[PDB]
Structure formats: structure tokens, C-alpha cells
Amino acid sequence: LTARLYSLLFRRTSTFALTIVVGALFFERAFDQGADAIYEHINEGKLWKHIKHKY
Amino acid sequence: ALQVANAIIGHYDCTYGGGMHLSSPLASVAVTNKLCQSFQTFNICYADTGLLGAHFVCDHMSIDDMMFVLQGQWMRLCTSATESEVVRGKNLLRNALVSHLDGTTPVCEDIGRSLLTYGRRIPLAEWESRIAEVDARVVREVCSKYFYDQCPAVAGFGPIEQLPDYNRIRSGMFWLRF
Amino acid sequence: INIRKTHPLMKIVNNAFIDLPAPSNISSWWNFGSLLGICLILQILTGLFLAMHYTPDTTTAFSSVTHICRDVNYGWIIRYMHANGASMFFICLFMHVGRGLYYGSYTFLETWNIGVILLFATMATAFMGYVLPWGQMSFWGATVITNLLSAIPYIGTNLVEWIWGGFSVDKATLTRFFAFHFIFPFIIAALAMVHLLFLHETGSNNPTGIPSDTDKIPFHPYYTIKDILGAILLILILMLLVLFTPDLLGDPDNYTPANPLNTPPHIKPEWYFLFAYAILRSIPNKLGGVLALVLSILVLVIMPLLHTSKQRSMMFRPISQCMFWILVADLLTLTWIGGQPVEHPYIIIGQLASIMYFLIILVMMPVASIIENNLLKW
Amino acid sequence: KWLEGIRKWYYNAAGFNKLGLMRDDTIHENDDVKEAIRRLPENLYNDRVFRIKRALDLSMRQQILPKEQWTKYEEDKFYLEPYLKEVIRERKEREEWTKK
Amino acid sequence: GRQFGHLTRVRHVITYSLSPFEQRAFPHYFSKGIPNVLRRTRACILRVAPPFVVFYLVYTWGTQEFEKSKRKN
Ligand code: HEM
Ligand code: HEM
């Protein structure tokens, strides 16, 4: 549950450096999708993709 | 396995013969910069528990240096355990074990504490076999489990004014490969 | 043994960051040294990219800053980081000084002197920075304060002739003020190192007032991550300010080009010089106002020379603690008054609060000290 | 006197009754205080460093010992004041002989 | 300000330091924290708060007096 995470990722230093790089790219892709989706959701309607589709 | 490791590291006192030529790197450095009065790095165990221990006596203006080189040798055994040091430790284990089991009281002491705990006495063929079983791979396995980022117990006594905080022992206890 | 203890740079690093024996008692009101440092080098960084994309000439100044607003990628956030980082910087500098006056670290003398010099340097530096971006408020307030430099007898007017390059605020004067804003923060950083050098010599101070030589702790890594925490709180305040109300501390009256014929009525410097404009305009004189200003900062110099208590802090002196919070309210009062234009009740309480300020310092502080001295059976 | 009750309310409102420090503990150090602290017996000296160490720990954790362990005003067993005033007088006498 | 080892002299003091992995990250973070911070809240308003209300009243009083000095046309 968590002992797996400690044994695979949080013993050695190169394993920890690789897992923070891996988490960086995973968090990159995920958070950009979330930011785009939520930000267009609070700005539904009057955004230039929408009017661009209506042009 | 810890007997082999603490045969490599082991003990020093200020009243020995030949300081700059000790095989033990901790002992050579502690002669070099004149750090410790004495130390012992050893094992004591109770029934499936106990204290894998180390104990140094020195002046208070040299404490963090001694602690630094002590943790440095521990992590050197943790990562770069090569063969010749393991060989030398197994020779010292032979010598200490055989010359310990001598006489009347050490013999009968061994047998009494063996058959209160084990249920049996260890013969010397078992000691020679369990010396021959353990190499540097077993050393790095045991050192990766027992030492590498484990919470310590530090007993400090006397002029402890330089002796660092517990978090320095924690953060320098492992290596981030420096 | 270790490279940290023997390497000739790393001994200085060891005596700087790793092994400073700090007291184990300070709350978050001691963060502001490293906070002012990170603010300072962030200011240097933002201003450096600014000066990469800026041309200093009155033909091209506001057009160049407009170009930073338009065409430089994230240039608008770099310009706003510089401006509101200066505003955050002066907030945190008043926090640092308010600490050092409250908790009794002003018994340290030469460090206090070098701090006072840093106060002068940061005032002049951010002032000429405000002269740079070529606004209505910039041009006219710098014109006023150029005449404030002319206020002194017998030396001052030819001195202002010498700083003019002519008779008024001209292109040569703009480039002068550009180079001085462009070069003074490095002298600020050097005297910051001198400030820190004297403090590493003496030793720090606790919140209480009792020197804590029994209970020191290593500086790393408690205060490293404590000041990183303080930095994150600082940076989110800075960024919420630049991303949600940039024109809050920004000015409406700033953004026109510098018209030498307008002189708008609601005239003001930035918020951090409002007491510098109110205590200025309080006493009905040219000489009296400028001498009152320089005498106010020289009163801030005097503030250690009249410590006649026998405790160290104001924490265990309650009457003087109430007096100190009265001083806090009075400085904020004159700040709001300096923001407000010149009308009759504000004239009244501006004069009243200025003379209250000098009466609090030169008379009330040692008298409160001797009452607190007398009352504990001394 | 009424001013004695003023002192009573003051030693209430100060705070180091709540911390557990006596009056000879909150003294700002010049060199005279340094000499006065060295001119002390061992038991007073260790009591002084222990009470200061408890004050630093309780001020770090910002938690205060209750009413039951506070220094009452009628147990102000001040100790350092005569030593300090004698070092004051000897410093004064040395001052005066350097004057004239 | 020097090294550790010559700061000052203290004898007869034993300190029991607990490892941080033994204790929880936030023990009694509300259950003692909120009543004791309301206690320290009680310990500060009668020292610091009277300048707050003085500035508060002088601010709104000056604004009212300011608009009244306007409105006397
Ligand atoms: C140029 C801006 C300044 C910077 C970057 C600065 C930086 C620092 C730093 C890093 C420290 C050590 C850590 C700390 O106590 O926060 C410090 C301490 C101190 N500073 Fe400044 N300082 C500045 C301005 C001033 C000014 C204007 C004064 C007032 C004259 C002052 C008075 C002090 C005092 C009294 C201390 C000792 C406080 C203590 O460590 O207990 N500083 N400063
Ligand atoms: C040496 C490093 C610095 C450089 C290169 C620099 C550069 C500049 C430049 C080019 C401008 C004019 C651009 C503009 O604001 O539209 C400027 C303005 C300014 N600077 Fe700096 N600066 C530096 C350090 C500082 C520091 C340390 C402060 C104070 C914390 C500061 C405060 C200001 C202020 C308040 C303005 C006016 C902002 C405005 O109203 O638009 N600068 N700086």
C-alpha cells in the first residue's frame, strides 16, 4: 500500500531522482489537462475557440 | 554478518603500537587528525532484539569530526563493500572467536548462555561454515537493511556542547551519494 | 575529513549557512532577513531583464516600457514582478526594522549603523527606479524632490545645478538616474554582507531578551526550510498582487506620458514615502520640512543611544509596549494622511501626529524606561 | 501604599511570573552583568541556567506553565542584586580614581 | 558566534530528545491548538487593540468631517 512505494522508490538516491522526474512529467501532462478543462469550464461561452467555431 | 562488519571496524585505544599504519580506515584517520581517545564498534543482542552498537570517547572539541568519519565508514560498507576488507574481517572474526572460546569460564559461559537461548551449543564446524558463507554481497545486503536510514539511539554524556542535533545524525546517516 | 570545514570558501559557507548557532526560540518575525535577501536578488533579476528590454530616453522611455508590456513574452509579468516586488520589499523592510526595534536587538550598535546606511541606500535606489519609467507622477515627484535637494542653504542650489545637467529634468538627468538605479543595488548587497558580517561576529538575539548561549541549535536545516516556508508565503502574496490587482499599488495618474504643463492635483509619491511627504508638508517651511525628514531618520539612528532600560526587550515592559504600538498606529496614521490631499482636518491631525511622533521618541521613551526601571524594586 | 498594589498588578501583568523566572534572570547584559553572573556560587548559577533553559523551551513551544508553578510576588527571592550593586560601586570607585 | 564547544558552561542537565518518526505530524493540532491560541488572543487585545480602535475612529471621523467640510457650500 505504501511499503511497496518505500522499497521501490525511496531507498536509493538515483531511484528517488528518477521518480521525481517521472512524477514531474506525469504531473505536467495531468495538470495541464486539468487546468485547460477547468479554466474553460469557468469561461464557457465567451472564449475565442467557441466564437472561432462560430466563425 | 554484523560480526564480520564489526570485525572490520571494531575497536581502537590510544595505547596501541603503530597508529599511522592501521588497516582500519577509521582508525588511521582518527590517529591522523587525533580525534578519539578510544572507540568500540560491536554488537550486543537480546532475544531477537538488541543494540548494534558503537561507543567512542574523545574530547569535546573533536566530536562532530569523529561522528562524521564514523558514519562515513558505515556508509562505505553500505555501498562499496569490496572483497579485501571482507577477507580481513573474516580473518579477524576467526581470531577473536577462537581466542575468545578458551579456558574454563569462557567455555562454560558460552555453553550456558547457548543452552538458555538456543536450545543447543554451536560447534566450531558451524562457525567455520558460517564464516565461509558470508561475502561482500551478503555484507551489502545486511548493511542496506540494518544501517541505511534507520533511526538511531544516541547516548551522549559529558561535554556534549559540540555534539550535533539528532537531525544531523538522520540527514547524514544515509548518503545521497554526497 | 570533510570539505565543509577545510575548503577556504566552504569555511565561509560553514560559518554562514550550516553552523550558525542560532537561538532555538525565534518565531516567524525573524524570517525577514533572508526574505529581504530573496526579495533583493529577485529585484535584481527582474530589473536585469527589464534593462535588457529598455531604452533610456524621454523620446523612447514610455514607448519602450509599452513595448515590454506588448511584445516581450511574459514581459508584462516581468515588469509587474519588479514593481510589486519593490512594494513587497519595502513592506518586509519595515517588518525587519519593527522586529529589531521591538525585541531589543538595537543594543547592537555598529550593525544598527550599517542597517541605517542600508535604509538610505534602498530609499534612494527604489526612488530613482521610480524616476525611470517616465510617468506624470514620476516626472513631477522627481521634480519636487530635486527641489527638495535644493532646499539646503549655501551648498544645495549649485548642487542641484550640478545634478540637473542644465536647469530642469532633462535627458541627461534621466540617464543619470538610470545609471544610479542601475548600479546601487550591488552596493546594497555588499553592505548587506557587511551587516551580516557584524551580526555573525556578535551573535543573534532571542524574542525574550536573555542571551541564549546555553541553548543554541545548528542553523541548517531548521531555518533553511523555515525561511523557504516564509519565502513561499511571500511569493504567493507577491503573485496574488501582480495577478489579481496590479493597479492596486499601481497608480492611475502614472500612466500618461510626462507632460511638463499639467501638474495633476491629487499628487502623491508611492505609498512607502507618504510619511516622507506628510512630515515634509507638515511644518510650513522648505528648510524646516527637509530638516524634519533628515532629522526623522537621524532619530532612527538615535534609537539605540537612549536605551536606558535594564531588560533588553519591550516584551517584559508593558507600558513601553503600549507606547510602541501607539508608534505603529502613528506611523500608519501619517501614512494615510500623506496619501490624503491637503485639507483642513487632515492638516490638523497631520501636524498633530508629526509632533506626537517626535514627542513619543525624544521624551516618552526614556521616561517610560525609567518608570519600568523604578517599578521592579530597583 | 497604592503604588504597592500597582507593583502587584504590574508583576502580574509582566509575564515572567508566568514563565518561571525570578527577577535576577531578565537582566540585559553589559560587561557589568557578565562580571555579576560570574561572581555567583555554583548552585545559584546552575539554577539560573536551568530556569533560563526552561524559559527558552516554553517560549519556543509557546505554552505556559499554569498558576500552580508561577513565581508569586511574595516569593521574589532575588539573589544577584547585592553582588551587582557591589560590582557597581567598585566600578564607580575605579571610575572616580580615573577621573581625578 | 563561534564554533560549538566554547559557548557557555552548563552542568547537570539531561535532555530527552524524541525522534520525529515516533510522533504524529500534528498532535492536538486543533484540540489544544485552538483553545490555547484563543488564550493568547485573550492575552493581546488589551495591549495591542487600543491603537486599532483609535485609528479606526480617527479614519472614519476624518472622512465624515472631510465630507462635511466639503458640504458647507
Ligand atoms: C538592506 C536591507 C536589510 C537586509 C537585507 C538585512 C538583512 C539582515 C539579515 C540577513 C539579518 C540576519 C537575520 C535576521 O535577523 O533577520 C539581519 C539582522 C538584523 N538587522 Fe538587518 N537587514 C536589512 C536592513 C536593516 C535595517 C535597516 C536595520 C535597522 C537599522 C537592520 C537591523 C538589523 C538588526 C538589529 C539585526 C539583528 C536582529 C537579530 O538577528 O536578532 N537591518 N538583517
Ligand atoms: C540593479 C538591479 C535593478 C535593475 C537593473 C533595475 C532596473 C529597473 C528598470 C529598467 C526600471 C524601469 C522600468 C519600469 O519600471 O517600467 C526600474 C524601475 C523600478 N525599479 Fe528597478 N532595478 C533594479 C533594482 C531595483 C531594486 C532593488 C528596487 C527596489 C526594491 C527597484 C525598484 C524599482 C521601482 C519601484 C521601479 C519603478 C517601477 C514602476 O513604477 O514602473 N529596482 N528598475
Side-chain angles (χ1 to χ4, degrees):
Chain A
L1 196 148
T2 311
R4 305 298 296 272
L5 203 68
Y6 178 75
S7 293
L8 292 178
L9 300 178
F10 299 102
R11 283 169 177 167
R12 289 184 62 194
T13 310
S14 292
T15 63
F16 187 79
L18 187 64
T19 193
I20 64 97
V21 171
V22 165
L25 273 77
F26 180 77
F27 173 66
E28 180 270 334
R29 190 86 270 273
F31 181 72
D32 284 334
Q33 281 286 317
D36 296 332
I38 299 298
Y39 183 67
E40 292 187 356
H41 179 71
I42 53 96
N43 292 324
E44 287 173 351
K46 71 278 281 184
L47 191 274
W48 185 63
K49 289 184 181 178
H50 303 268
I51 309 299
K52 189 261 285 181
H53 171 76
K54 292 181 182 179
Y55 286 156
Chain B
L2 293 176
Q3 287 305 112
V4 179
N6 294 112
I8 302 169
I9 305 174
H11 51 83
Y12 176 78
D13 188 77
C14 61
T15 63
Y16 289 172
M20 293 298 290
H21 289 165
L22 299 168
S23 300
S24 176
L26 175 60
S28 178
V29 173
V31 169
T32 306
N33 290 305
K34 295 186 179 183
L35 295 172
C36 71
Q37 300 299 322
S38 68
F39 60 95
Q40 53 184 0
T41 64
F42 64 95
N43 189 8
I44 293 172
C45 286
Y46 297 95
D48 288 332
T49 179
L51 304 176
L52 175 60
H55 166 64
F56 58 96
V57 190
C58 67
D59 186 77
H60 58 88
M61 294 304 296
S62 303
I63 287 178
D64 182 71
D65 298 332
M66 186 66 203
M67 199 62 217
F68 187 82
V69 186
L70 183 65
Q71 288 183 354
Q73 288 296 109
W74 268 355
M75 296 310 114
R76 182 186 174 184
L77 290 184
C78 284
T79 62
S80 68
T82 66
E83 189 65 28
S84 175
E85 51 185 358
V86 175
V87 171
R88 189 180 65 248
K90 290 193 281 190
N91 292 119
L92 294 174
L93 187 61
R94 291 183 179 93
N95 297 307
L97 189 59
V98 171
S99 182
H100 172 268
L101 293 177
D102 192 1
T104 66
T105 302
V107 170
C108 195
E109 182 173 1
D110 172 77
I111 300 160
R113 289 185 289 108
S114 298
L115 279 83
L116 286 179
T117 59
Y118 296 162
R120 61 182 294 275
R121 184 193 180 276
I122 293 175
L124 273 75
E126 180 174 357
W127 289 120
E128 183 68 30
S129 181
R130 291 188 177 181
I131 282 175
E133 285 167 351
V134 170
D135 61 351
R137 181 184 181 270
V138 181
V139 170
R140 67 180 184 267
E141 287 171 348
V142 172
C143 290
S144 297
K145 186 182 180 183
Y146 282 99
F147 293 105
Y148 177 76
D149 193 2
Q150 297 297 114
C151 295
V154 168
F157 182 67
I160 62 162
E161 182 178 356
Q162 195 188 7
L163 179 64
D165 198 5
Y166 187 79
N167 284 321
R168 295 293 296 277
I169 296 103
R170 299 303 306 272
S171 297
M173 178 54 76
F174 63 92
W175 275 357
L176 48 95
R177 295 293 187 270
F178 181 73
Chain C
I1 297 170
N2 193 356
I3 309 101
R4 195 184 75 246
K5 294 174 185 176
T6 60
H7 188 75
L9 276 166
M10 294 185 72
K11 293 178 185 179
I12 307 297
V13 181
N14 195 359
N15 292 316
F17 289 171
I18 293 99
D19 285 335
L20 181 62
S24 63
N25 206 168
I26 53 172
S27 71
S28 295
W29 298 98
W30 280 257
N31 292 322
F32 294 112
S34 70
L35 290 178
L36 282 169
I38 294 173
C39 284
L40 182 61
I41 55 173
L42 195 147
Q43 282 298 112
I44 295 170
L45 194 145
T46 61
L48 182 59
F49 290 173
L50 256 292
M52 296 198 305
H53 299 297
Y54 166 71
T55 59
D57 191 73
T58 70
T59 306
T60 60
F62 178 65
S63 177
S64 64
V65 180
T66 300
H67 174 270
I68 301 160
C69 294
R70 295 178 191 270
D71 300 334
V72 179
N73 294 115
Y74 308 110
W76 59 279
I77 78 171
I78 294 174
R79 191 264 187 92
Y80 285 158
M81 282 190 184
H82 190 80
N84 283 323
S87 299
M88 288 294 293
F89 185 76
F90 278 153
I91 287 298
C92 291
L93 184 56
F94 281 110
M95 298 299 175
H96 174 84
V97 172
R99 190 276 326 275
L101 196 144
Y102 185 80
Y103 295 95
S105 295
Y106 69 103
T107 67
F108 294 165
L109 298 176
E110 63 276 20
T111 310
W112 189 265
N113 304 129
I114 302 303
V116 165
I117 300 299
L118 283 172
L119 180 62
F120 287 115
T122 50
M123 283 176 67
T125 299
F127 182 72
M128 292 173 184
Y130 189 75
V131 179
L132 276 177
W134 195 251
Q136 198 70 36
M137 305 297 275
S138 301
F139 181 78
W140 283 109
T143 306
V144 171
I145 296 177
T146 304
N147 290 309
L148 285 173
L149 292 176
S150 74
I152 288 171
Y154 181 74
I155 298 168
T157 298
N158 291 111
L159 196 72
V160 165
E161 295 168 357
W162 166 68
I163 69 167
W164 267 337
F167 292 94
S168 178
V169 178
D170 201 354
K171 297 177 177 65
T173 304
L174 187 272
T175 58
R176 289 172 188 269
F177 288 155
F178 170 65
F180 290 123
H181 179 71
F182 196 40
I183 202 163
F184 273 173
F186 296 106
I187 301 173
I188 289 174
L191 295 183
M193 289 181 181
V194 172
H195 178 79
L196 180 59
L197 179 59
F198 289 115
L199 186 56
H200 282 173
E201 181 70 33
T202 64
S204 293
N205 190 4
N206 58 356
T208 69
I210 299 170
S212 68
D213 296 334
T214 74
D215 199 1
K216 303 292 186 182
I217 56 171
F219 191 80
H220 182 80
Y222 298 94
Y223 296 104
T224 62
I225 207 161
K226 188 179 189 299
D227 287 329
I228 290 171
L229 180 71
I232 298 304
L233 291 177
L234 184 145
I235 291 299
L236 73 96
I237 294 299
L238 176 56
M239 288 297 105
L240 266 64
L241 188 64
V242 302
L243 292 178
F244 292 95
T245 59
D247 289 332
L248 185 140
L249 297 171
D251 298 331
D253 207 354
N254 198 359
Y255 282 155
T256 63
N259 191 2
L261 296 173
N262 197 1
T263 309
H266 300 285
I267 186 66
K268 61 187 178 183
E270 204 73 27
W271 58 270
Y272 49 80
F273 285 161
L274 291 177
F275 64 94
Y277 194 73
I279 301 169
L280 183 67
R281 68 189 175 183
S282 68
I283 289 173
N285 193 359
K286 194 173 180 180
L287 176 60
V290 62
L291 181 62
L293 185 64
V294 176
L295 277 175
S296 178
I297 295 102
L298 289 172
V299 156
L300 306 174
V301 182
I302 287 169
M303 290 299 291
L305 292 179
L306 298 177
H307 181 70
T308 183
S309 175
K310 295 175 70 68
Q311 289 83 15
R312 185 170 179 177
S313 172
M314 296 180 187
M315 179 180 172
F316 296 109
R317 289 182 291 114
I319 296 173
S320 297
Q321 187 181 9
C322 297
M323 290 302 294
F324 166 70
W325 284 102
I326 286 170
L327 201 279
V328 176
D330 187 77
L331 287 180
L332 187 143
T333 297
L334 280 174
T335 304
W336 170 62
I337 291 301
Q340 292 295 107
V342 182
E343 288 287 325
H344 188 275
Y346 294 155
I347 286 169
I348 291 170
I349 60 175
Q351 294 167 354
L352 192 146
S354 176
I355 306 166
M356 180 183 282
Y357 174 74
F358 286 155
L359 186 146
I360 282 167
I361 299 162
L362 283 175
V363 179
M364 292 290 105
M365 297 296 106
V367 168
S369 177
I370 201 64
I371 292 172
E372 292 288 329
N373 191 359
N374 194 4
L375 209 144
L376 275 178
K377 299 184 292 293
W378 291 344
Chain D
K1 193 181 182 292
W2 186 65
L3 192 144
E4 191 271 331
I6 294 173
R7 291 182 181 176
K8 183 177 179 178
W9 170 73
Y10 174 75
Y11 183 81
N12 192 3
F16 64 97
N17 57 357
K18 299 182 180 70
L19 293 174
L21 299 176
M22 289 182 180
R23 202 269 306 273
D24 290 327
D25 298 325
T26 63
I27 181 67
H28 170 69
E29 292 188 356
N30 58 0
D31 301 330
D32 313 331
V33 180
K34 297 168 71 69
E35 179 66 29
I37 292 305
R38 185 174 61 195
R39 293 184 180 184
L40 282 172
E42 182 69 25
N43 59 357
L44 279 172
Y45 183 69
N46 283 320
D47 281 339
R48 192 176 188 273
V49 297
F50 179 70
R51 293 172 297 157
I52 293 166
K53 194 170 175 66
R54 284 199 293 113
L56 292 171
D57 185 77
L58 291 164
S59 175
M60 174 184 65
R61 282 195 282 116
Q62 294 176 353
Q63 191 66 41
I64 302 167
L65 299 176
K67 181 72 173 67
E68 59 194 3
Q69 290 186 356
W70 289 347
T71 65
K72 298 180 259 75
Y73 183 71
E74 308 301 327
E75 61 180 359
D76 184 74
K77 302 298 191 292
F78 62 95
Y79 53 90
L80 187 272
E81 181 178 357
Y83 287 93
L84 188 268
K85 289 180 178 178
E86 295 296 322
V87 179
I88 282 176
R89 292 178 69 247
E90 290 177 350
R91 198 270 312 275
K92 281 180 177 295
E93 189 176 359
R94 186 186 63 189
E95 283 171 349
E96 190 270 335
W97 180 254
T98 52
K99 299 299 187 291
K100 60 102 174 182
Chain E
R2 66 183 63 86
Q3 81 280 15
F4 293 92
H6 273 170
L7 303 172
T8 190
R9 182 175 176 88
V10 167
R11 299 174 71 185
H12 305 290
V13 171
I14 295 173
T15 303
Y16 312 103
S17 299
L18 181 64
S19 179
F21 284 167
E22 187 69 24
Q23 57 184 350
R24 287 187 286 117
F26 297 97
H28 301 90
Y29 182 68
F30 294 99
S31 64
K32 298 298 290 294
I34 305 301
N36 280 320
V37 75
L38 292 177
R39 184 191 58 82
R40 287 189 289 167
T41 299
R42 182 172 290 108
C44 69
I45 56 171
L46 292 177
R47 291 187 182 183
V48 183
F52 274 101
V53 293
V54 164
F55 182 72
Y56 184 78
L57 262 299
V58 170
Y59 178 73
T60 60
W61 180 71
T63 298
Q64 286 298 111
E65 188 182 5
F66 178 70
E67 286 297 324
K68 192 70 69 176
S69 65
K70 289 289 187 180
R71 289 184 189 180
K72 290 179 184 177
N73 291 322

